[PDB]
Design a protein around this ligand. Structure first.
Ligand code: A1CCE
Lengths: 143, 130, 143
């Protein structure tokens, strides 16, 4: 077996106007020290980690406004109070004004320390999509 | 020491997403050889000559067929809407999953008619035991 | 633990009119042999690597034919193009200039040799976006 800290949390299809992460679901886990505290993954030990996250946005008809969709994975060091962007993307789904779909996939390898908190956050949770399993997730893998 | 797999799409097998190896590849699916944590990853590239009048949806999904629960369950999935000039749309999936010995894994798309076999190093699917 | 070569370099927000990669920054790294020489990642050993890169373009409106390119190339010790994308953000010209956003992600698995130099390059660095960290990056992961 592997003693490697790993985590794969999935979005709750019933957290009104927010992106709430869960481990107590099928095909989602927290293992070898990784904790999910206040919607954030707590790094159990210093090392290199693969951080990833995907969100799927969907909008029934192109809204009557230019819409900005952001997805950001942040790092809050043990002492820090707020985010420090690790990976971030911003997409404009609506050029003009049929349902649109926009997935955002962030991933990279980062050096993390003992007790750092990682958060995957979006600006528009009103456009999230949970109509199918495995479309919205956040995870980490120690190398 | 640790089971690994990296299969690529067959360019010469047009109209379907068929995987080719260099873990077993049985009936277009990766068979997990032992219980453990695995990194599952995949990428597909779509391409189309302009936009048709009938709306289009492009999906890519990695599924699991558990040794107790014989039904396909979604592990990772994404959906993109690409719509007289051509377009290109990649979809990439990856995550860490606890798998059991004998689990079948299948990366699948809905529209193989829009696949881009032209990009070799871009249509792939693999697993890495941690 | 992991002896596998990994790299995650980020664009310098200060560097005007160019896409300059940095490792000497917080939440950016070079590990297990990967070097950053003359804006290029030097592959330390033969093997299969995941090559990933993201750039974010932003422009204040659509004036009267923009082409935005992003390309990853390998220079052997034999110059080759690995991944490339070209986007036209203004597929309609604003006749109130609303800002457009165009992210380009390139990624693939490639067999590389020891001493290969990898470069992630764009044609229009005047449209780059440095409003927040984590938006522009280039990295490799040995498999
Ligand atoms: O603990 C250990 N030890 C062994 C294993 C190695 N290792 C590892 N291997 C392969 C890959 C990879 C290979 C091919 C992909 N194709 C995509 N991915 C792959 N990961 C995703 C998802 N997507 C984009 C992307 C971008 C950046 C990072 C990820 C990814 C497509 C990522 N990590 C680091 C962790 N490990």
């Amino acid at each position: 077996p592997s003693d490697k800290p790993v985590a794969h949390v999935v979005a709750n299809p019933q957290a009104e106007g927010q992106l709430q992460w869960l481990n107590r679901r099928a095909n989602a886990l927290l293992a070898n020290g990784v904790e999910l505290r206040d919607n954030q993954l707590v790094v159990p030990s210093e090392g290199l980690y693969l951080i990833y996250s995907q969100v799927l946005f969907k909008g029934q008809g192109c809204p009557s406004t230019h819409v900005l969709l952001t997805h950001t994975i942040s790092r809050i060091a043990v002492s820090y109070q707020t985010k420090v962007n690790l990976l971030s993307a911003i997409k404009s789904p609506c050029q003009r004004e049929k349902p649109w779909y926009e997935p955002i996939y962030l991933g990279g390898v980062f050096q993390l320390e003992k007790g750092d908190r990682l958060s995957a956050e979006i600006n528009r949770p009103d456009y999230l999509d949970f109509a199918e399993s495995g479309q919205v997730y956040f995870g980490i893998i120690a190398l």
